[PDB]
Design a protein around this ligand. Structure first.
Ligand SMILES: [Zn+2]
Ligand SMILES: [Zn+2]
Ligand SMILES: [Zn+2]
Lengths: 68, 87
């Protein structure tokens, strides 16, 4: 089932979260080609059926999704 | 590499050419989905905290930052390439 609504807000909480997984990020991407948002990663958040559980920095820290 | 909302410019900005961006304070990031069968997406984070999705956006970033010394093959979006190991 969907994790985000048609605008790329989380269904569970309604929050508008950057795919870089810093909960406080303003949106660090260029405009998403599909919806315009600076918060969408490789795949648009709108109606997406998954979220990122973690991000591994090559040579560095693992970042965990603070919400999941 | 926190991001503050900005328009990029020049002020934003080796044995192994794959390590050159990392020496210039880029990060290479591997994002793991929560799908039952997991997918990985590679992105780069720039020195000014911009996230880049693909080589077209790397090109845009190097144009905006007037960077003449990084090229297409200094970057890889392949989830199985390790920058330390695949050179
Ligand atoms: Zn972000
Ligand atoms: Zn989008
Ligand atoms: Zn910048």
């Amino acid at each position: 089932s969907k994790v985000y609504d048609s605008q790329g807000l989380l269904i569970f909480s309604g929050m508008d979260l950057c795919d870089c997984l810093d909960e406080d990020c303003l949106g660090c991407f260029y405009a998403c080609p599909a919806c315009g948002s600076t918060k969408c990663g490789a795949e648009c958040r709108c109606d997406r059926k998954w979220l990122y559980e973690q991000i591994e920095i090559e040579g560095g820290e693992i970042i965990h999704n603070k919400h999941a | 590499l926190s991001y503050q909302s900005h328009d990029c410019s020049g002020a934003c900005l080796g044995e192994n050419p794959l390590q050159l961006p990392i020496k210039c304070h880029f990060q290479r990031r591997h994002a793991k989905t929560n799908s039952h069968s997991s997918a990985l997406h590679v992105s780069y984070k720039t020195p000014c905290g911009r996230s880049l999705r693909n080589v077209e956006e790397v090109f845009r970033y190097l144009l905006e930052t007037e960077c003449n010394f990084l090229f297409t093959d200094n970057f890889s979006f392949n989830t199985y390439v390790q920058l330390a190991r695949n050179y």
